[PDB]
Amino acid sequence: NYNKAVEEEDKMTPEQLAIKNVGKQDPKRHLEEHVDVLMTSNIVQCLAAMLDTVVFK
Amino acid sequence: PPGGGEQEPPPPPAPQDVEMKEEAATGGGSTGEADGKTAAAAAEHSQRELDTVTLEDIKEHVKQLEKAVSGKEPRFVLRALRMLPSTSRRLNHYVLYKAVQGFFTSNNATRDFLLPFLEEPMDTEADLQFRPRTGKAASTPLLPEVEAYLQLLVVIFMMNSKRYKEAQKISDDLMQKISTQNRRALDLVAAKCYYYHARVYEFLDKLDVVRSFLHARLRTATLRHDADGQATLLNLLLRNYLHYSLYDQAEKLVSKSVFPEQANNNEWARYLYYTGRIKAIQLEYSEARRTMTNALRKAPQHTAVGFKQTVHKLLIVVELLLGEIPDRLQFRQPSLKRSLMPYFLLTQAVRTGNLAKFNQVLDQFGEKFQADGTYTLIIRLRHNVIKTGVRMISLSYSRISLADIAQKLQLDSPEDAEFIVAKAIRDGVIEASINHEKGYVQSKEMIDIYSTREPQLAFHQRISFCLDIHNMSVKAMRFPPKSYNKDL
Amino acid sequence: MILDKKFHGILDQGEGVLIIFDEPPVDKTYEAALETIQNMSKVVDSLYNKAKKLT
Amino acid sequence: LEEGKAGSGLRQYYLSKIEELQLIVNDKSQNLRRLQAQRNELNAKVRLLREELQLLQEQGSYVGEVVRAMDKKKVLVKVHPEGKFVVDVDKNIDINDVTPNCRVALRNDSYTLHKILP
Amino acid sequence: DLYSRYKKLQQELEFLEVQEEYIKDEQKNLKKEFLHAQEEVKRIQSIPLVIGQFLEAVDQNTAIVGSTTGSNYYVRILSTIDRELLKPNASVALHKHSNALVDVLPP
Amino acid sequence: PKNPDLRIAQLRFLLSLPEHRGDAAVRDELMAAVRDNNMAPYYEALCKSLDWQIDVDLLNKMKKANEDELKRLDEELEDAEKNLGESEIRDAMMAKAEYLCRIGDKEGALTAFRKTYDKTVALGHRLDIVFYLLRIGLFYMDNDLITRNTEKAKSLIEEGGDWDRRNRLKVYQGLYCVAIRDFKQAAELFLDTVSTFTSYELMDYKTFVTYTVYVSMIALERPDLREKVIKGAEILEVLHSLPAVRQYLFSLYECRYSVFFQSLAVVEQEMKKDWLFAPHYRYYVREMRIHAYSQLLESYRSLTLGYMAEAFGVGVEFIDQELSRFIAAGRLHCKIDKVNEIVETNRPDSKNWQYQETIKKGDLLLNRVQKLSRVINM
Amino acid sequence: MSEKKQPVDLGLLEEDDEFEEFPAEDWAGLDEDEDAHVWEDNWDDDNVEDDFSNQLRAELEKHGYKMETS
């Protein structure tokens, strides 16, 4: 929901990038937060193999 | 006399500026770009030169220029000749010789001065220093200009241009393997040469010369190549192997080597159509389907239209073998439309699969698809009709009747029903239960998908393969930003 | 009233069997698929910037 | 002859391709070290925010308002109540630029001016 | 020179080689340091704090703040907070000691 | 144009293809030949008409009054010319241009509506000229030519939804969405039918109902019909006009095939022989059959062929080849079996298929990031 | 290369020189009913259309006669 809730903001961005391209006015970056969201999402992947080890022995 | 006589010296004076500006822009851009360090900066003029070539493939250049416009033919590069230092008076000469033809007129002709094009390549091509890159940058663009209009005894003039090309650079080379940006240019440049008079080759001759040497020049690169130009030289070999080779103990799986980084953003598509065309004769159903449809979907840059009728036509030709034939659905262009304008009645005649009618229908208006050669996959189609139709029976119900569906398959006997249905059973593409309780043949016909049927093992491999593709795409967004921040 | 989905069930004429079942995790495929469709315009508009800047 | 020109010549060509490989190791070292300079400057930047953290421990700073400049380089400045603290402001800023009857930025203990304010 | 360029150059191959695992060590260590200083400046931001009120922003990333006591304070604001929170009539909240703003409150 | 010669000249399609109904259709065309300068339309479709005996009588009279009122619009235009005014020249050029719609020639009407299209003092008059191209573009059945001025007159309106201007354009959205087979975005267009009215410039109100009952009747489901129209009182007013329509809503919604197929022949014969409604008559039939079979087959897991044949009132031989064509061709559900001679579906389309609807977009995004890989380095 | 597009396009100009605007106008007889209608639907409609262009095209008029006979 935070991902898609930023994707509605990045929906508008390629018009801005399709107009100006000179100088940056937004302190919001939209990238590293979503990298962090992926890092928290990879807990599922890291703990799936943990489940595989517990299920193994 | 006033109509063309007044508008004659008007229209012309217009491609002169863009062609001279173009040869000064890519010539002085290439030499003035990689002059100091050619070895450091590489392939920056790769896309530039090919985009100028595809930019000049649609030239309406010579329509009237046989009559008294031929002053552009004896003129040439003439940059910084006869002495490598002290070129300031030659900087004067650059305006001088262009200004001599601009006072009154010039004595001009077309077909006389072709053979002494080697006057400067004997002593100094341009400068005596950058002789390779200025030699190919001088000679190689202008040879498709004069050797355009291949017909009308310019084939012999093309043979002169051949032996001049080999004689100065590609008999062996001037230094074997240049090992620079013009070596890497000379790969696809010499290739493009061999494609260009490959029309001269197949025009009267066939495989029996430069193509046989091109294996030795194909391996003279040492192997340490990225093999892009080596792959382009492989493409003329495989297209030479398209019309008649048919032997598979060399090129098929033998030619198949390392599979180098062969990209070009074209050569995946056309290389892949070539190997899919030759891999289309054993009727590949899994691989050539998806990857040849992929090669259809590649090359979007210049046209998606004019050439992909061939990978498209061959594609649907092998798609109707499997029983499920998708037509032209999502792409709208009236070239593939006219391409399938003969094919439409028969490709709609695939699915209903009426034997005696459609057998007459194919050969009936069969002109160009049956004049396309040797009736091979249509002659496999002629008895693939009942197999794709009985595959639609497999998409229909289980039990096989002796009157209803046997009459419906135009096939009226107890033996041949279970026999040819059993020929669909020995395929393995279906799911069926051979049972005789009273003589009627059952099938369980279970087309149940893996949804709640071993899902972990099923899209297990989908997860591994898909994540490998997405994560090598993550590599493909890691390394080109390294190629961004490399210069700065 | 199964067709108006007032409750969970599905009928039968040969066997007369009623089966009652439900699907609670509705919000996964929604947000997943809408994230795909919203990322479509990101990639395609990116290709409009890049198809602009190269050719 | 035909070895130093040809066999050691192509050995030297292979050395030139090795220079292409060190152009790959070269530019990877370039862009990875520019990324390294980026992380060095960014983590250095939040380290300079820790340098600002002592001025966070300052409890911020006050708002000076000069109503009258004094000619002894000791500017009387109207402060929030129990204020009116006459002081020399910092040495890197001149006194005459500070116009009277205008609001300025003043530290809360050291009483040194930062800038003129509207 | 010419044949000496080979073995002379091999040392440059090795010296450029040694920068590889070095830049690996830097790129693995300094991002760990980045989350060190990142978490350490994060744990400066603590929830017990004083609430002021915003009056004016006189330049970029530095502004003035009316305290609850009415005395106006001059604080360089923290860099992570964007320009939305530079609203002139806002419910700003600094720290009780650091007196830098973590968040503004909805009225 | 907006004349009734639009709708009389709209009968040429049913005049054309059967020889049966071409008697009354030529009757009101020959009777309407004296109206709205009808000369050039039936002279154009005169190959689709009778002989030349009585035809050459009235052409000589219409051709001269053509130039008489034409040159009175020309001299009246010149007296409107060289004088201070905008709407005088706009209306002189416009009445000239609608007169050129009466002769049926958009050569002089294209440049005439182009000139008064350049004399538009406001965008509302501009949209009026736009609609004056739409009403003859209906008879002319151009596609892009009449979507061009609605695309350009679409943006920058700023004057609010007017009462039958904006409503008239919304009706025209109903027109080209009857033309095109986009339906789920045609489902919003008839929602103004509270405000739609007898529009003799294009279309009668009861014919607007008669045409919107198809897109509602096929293109909408039971939450859609129960939401919009079964809730809505507008169809509750006009259902009393024809008793058939009430059967095609209540028996279809009641899922009674034995009467709906008995009456569906009237939808078939009605469905053809129509101007803008003809070429899709193959699609509405099949689409309505599969939508009905999905309507019954949704709430039903297993189904005998006895209650099914009783339900449809048809032999088992036809529903045999039906759903066999609707596995591959129609593509409704999972595989149906005849080992017990009983319709049995599985339909695991909720749990895992709810996730695997996205693998298509996963592969399409996969090839699109292969295209992103094709952007790399060239 | 894209210069091998040239003899394939010479083949295309021979295909366009087979019939000169006979198929564009006559097939435009179907395109004028088919233009701006989404041609993914025209493959389904063309599929069942060409399927029933042989026999039993409308056929819903016949099912009322199939009631008493079947």
UniProtKB/Swiss-Prot annotation, chain A:
The modification Phosphothreonine is found at residue 13. Widely expressed. Highest levels in heart and skeletal muscle. Transmembrane segments: none annotated. It comes from the Eukaryota. Component of the 19S proteasome regulatory particle complex. The 26S proteasome consists of a 20S core particle (CP) and two 19S regulatory subunits (RP). The regulatory particle is made of a lid composed of 9 subunits including PSMD4, a base containing 6 ATPases and few additional components. Within the complex, PSMD4 interacts with subunit PSMD7 through their respective MPN domain. Interacts with TXNL1. Belongs to the peptidase M67A family. PSMD14 subfamily. Component of the 26S proteasome, a multiprotein complex involved in the ATP-dependent degradation of ubiquitinated proteins. This complex plays a key role in the maintenance of protein homeostasis by removing misfolded or damaged proteins, which could impair cellular functions, and by removing proteins whose functions are no longer required. Therefore, the proteasome participates in numerous cellular processes, including cell cycle progression, apoptosis, or DNA damage repair. This is 26S proteasome non-ATPase regulatory subunit 14. It comes from Homo sapiens (Human). The lineage of its organism: Eukaryota, Metazoa, Chordata, Craniata, Vertebrata. The gene is PSMD14.
From Swiss-Prot, chain C:
It comes from the Eukaryota. This is 26S proteasome non-ATPase regulatory subunit 11. Component of the 19S proteasome regulatory particle complex. The 26S proteasome consists of a 20S core particle (CP) and two 19S regulatory subunits (RP). The regulatory particle is made of a lid composed of 9 subunits including PSMD11, a base containing 6 ATPases and few additional components. Belongs to the proteasome subunit S9 family. Phosphorylated by AMPK. The lineage of its organism: Eukaryota, Metazoa, Chordata, Craniata, Vertebrata. Induction: By FOXO4; expression in embryonic stem cells (ESCs) is mediated by FOXO4. Highly expressed in embryonic stem cells (ESCs). Expression decreases as ESCs differentiate. It is found in: Nucleus; Cytoplasm, Cytosol. Component of the 26S proteasome, a multiprotein complex involved in the ATP-dependent degradation of ubiquitinated proteins. This complex plays a key role in the maintenance of protein homeostasis by removing misfolded or damaged proteins, which could impair cellular functions, and by removing proteins whose functions are no longer required. Therefore, the proteasome participates in numerous cellular processes, including cell cycle progression, apoptosis, or DNA damage repair. In the complex, PSMD11 is required for proteasome assembly.
From Swiss-Prot, chain E:
It is found in: Cytoplasm; Nucleus. GO terms for cellular component: ciliary basal body; cytosol; membrane; nucleoplasm; nucleus; proteasome accessory complex; proteasome complex; proteasome regulatory particle, base subcomplex. It comes from the Eukaryota. Disulfide bonds: none annotated. One of its GO terms (molecular function) is proteasome-activating activity. One of its GO terms (biological process) is proteolysis. Keywords: Acetylation, ATP-binding, Cytoplasm, Nucleotide-binding, Nucleus, Phosphoprotein, Proteasome. The keyword ATP-binding applies. Component of the 19S proteasome regulatory particle complex. The 26S proteasome consists of a 20S core particle (CP) and two 19S regulatory subunits (RP). The regulatory particle is made of a lid composed of 9 subunits, a base containing 6 ATPases including PSMC4 and few additional components. Interacts with NR1I3. Interacts with PAAF1. Interacts with TRIM5. Interacts with ZFAND1. Component of the 26S proteasome, a multiprotein complex involved in the ATP-dependent degradation of ubiquitinated proteins. This complex plays a key role in the maintenance of protein homeostasis by removing misfolded or damaged proteins, which could impair cellular functions, and by removing proteins whose functions are no longer required. Therefore, the proteasome participates in numerous cellular processes, including cell cycle progression, apoptosis, or DNA damage repair. Belongs to the AAA ATPase family. The chain holds residues 39 to 145 of 418 of the full protein.
From Swiss-Prot, chain F:
PANTHER family: 26S PROTEASOME NON-ATPASE REGULATORY SUBUNIT 6, 26S PROTESOME SUBUNIT 6. The keyword Magnesium does not apply. Pfam families: PCI, RPN7, RPN7_PSMD6_C. GO terms for cellular component: cytosol; extracellular region; ficolin-1-rich granule lumen; nucleoplasm; proteasome accessory complex; proteasome complex; proteasome regulatory particle; secretory granule lumen. Belongs to the proteasome subunit S10 family. Component of the 19S proteasome regulatory particle complex. The 26S proteasome consists of a 20S core particle (CP) and two 19S regulatory subunits (RP). The regulatory particle is made of a lid composed of 9 subunits including PSMD6, a base containing 6 ATPases and few additional components. The gene is PSMD6. It comes from the Eukaryota. Keywords: Proteasome. GO terms for biological process: proteasome-mediated ubiquitin-dependent protein catabolic process. Residues 182-350 form the PCI domain. This is 26S proteasome non-ATPase regulatory subunit 6. Component of the 26S proteasome, a multiprotein complex involved in the ATP-dependent degradation of ubiquitinated proteins. This complex plays a key role in the maintenance of protein homeostasis by removing misfolded or damaged proteins, which could impair cellular functions, and by removing proteins whose functions are no longer required. Therefore, the proteasome participates in numerous cellular processes, including cell cycle progression, apoptosis, or DNA damage repair.
